[PDB]
Structure formats: C-alpha cells, structure tokens
C-alpha cells in the first residue's frame, strides 16, 4: 500500500 519513491526499482 506504500507508494514507491520517484527513483525506486
């Protein structure tokens, strides 16, 4: 449910 940061993955 936690949104990932702009730079994640």
């Amino acid at each position: 449910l936690l949104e990932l940061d702009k730079w994640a993955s």
Partner: antibody
Amino acid sequence: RITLKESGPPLVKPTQTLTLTCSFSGFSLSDFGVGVGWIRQPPGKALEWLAIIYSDDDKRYSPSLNTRLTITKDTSKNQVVLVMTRVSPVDTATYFCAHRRGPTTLFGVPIARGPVNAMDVWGQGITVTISS
Amino acid sequence: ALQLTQSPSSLSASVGDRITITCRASQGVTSALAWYRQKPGSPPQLLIYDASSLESGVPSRFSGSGSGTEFTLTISTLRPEDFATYYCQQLHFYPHTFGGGTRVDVRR
C-alpha cells in the same frame, strides 16, 4: 553553490491560510529530476516531512496533511511555494525547504541514482507561530 | 504506515569516543537512507546519503552502513561539534519518513 531561503509570515491565526515561499539559487527546477521538499520541526520536537515537488512538476504530499497542502513551483523565479490551509496551533514550527538531487547523468544519460537518496542542502528555516 | 526507529533515543559520550547510532525500518527501504546532524538553532546537515556514501565536505570520521531494515551511523572519534541530535531519513517510499532522532550529549 546551492542556497535556499524560506520566507513568509512569522505569525498566523488559527483557521487562516499559511503561504510559505522557498527562494533558491545554484540550480533550476528545470534541471533533470531535481526536487525541492518541505520539512517542518515543532519546538523541541522531531523533523516531519511535508511535501516535495520535482522539475517535471510531479508532486507528493504527506498523507496526513494532504487535504491542507498545496505545493507549486515557479520555474522562472526559482521559487517553490507551499500553501497550508486551516492551520491550528499544532502547526507552529520551524519550516524548512530543501534540495534533492536528481540522478547523476553522463552525456545526458542517467547513470547513478544513489545521489537522490537524501535532501542535501537545506534552508535556514523560518519560524512560524500559530496563535489567535 | 512505515516506521523508522532510532536507537538509542539519547546517548552520552565524551570527546574522542566512537559511537554508533542505529535506525531500523518497519519495511525494507533498500539503500535509500540518509543521516543528518542537527545543531541547536540550525538546519539539519547531510552526512551520509544512499546508506553509506560520504557526502562531499563531510569529515571522514562519519560512516554509514546497512541496507534493508537496519542502518547504522558511526562516528569514529567524537569531536566537540558532534554533540548534537542526529536523524535518519528514509526515501524509498512516500512519504519520506524521518526517524525520531538521537541526542548525543556530554557525559559526566
């Protein structure tokens, strides 16, 4: 060299709207992946993250404050504005704006995202008190 | 809601000591964690970014390690300007959570 400075009213009354401005130099909000965020700190308390806006105009807000916050950027003026509505005394704190690096690029190609993992330069902070 | 817990919350030390501070996250945040030092009356200052990278201009006595849910900041030889409050920050998930801080003061 990057510098940021917060400005706004030192005093605001409950239910009123607080508008804070972050004026910066040394970078542009048209620079790839760069961000400017807002963090606050009640007297004697811990840091609390508020919001952030990027040069591509992507924005994010603290979930517990998103109904009262609006963040916007004026690219040409090198400013970022944070608007907080319906303030109450618990909103009194020192408000800081800060810079977040975008990924390192090589010949305009992103090669390292490690540098985005921090808010590297902060403003001196502006003290705001909410009282009637 | 992500939890970022610093330990200890307070610590006494003396000039010259080596101290470590930890930050534990409720969910993995990979290497996206930063450490700051904040002196009274000033804004926080970046020490370590990502989780172990030394920020330019920061003295080499500061070091960071860990990934996932456990991070630690260590100051090899405490200097006078290091008596302050330290904070960790998570930037893997929105919102970008800050730890509760750990006050480092003069032992007596």
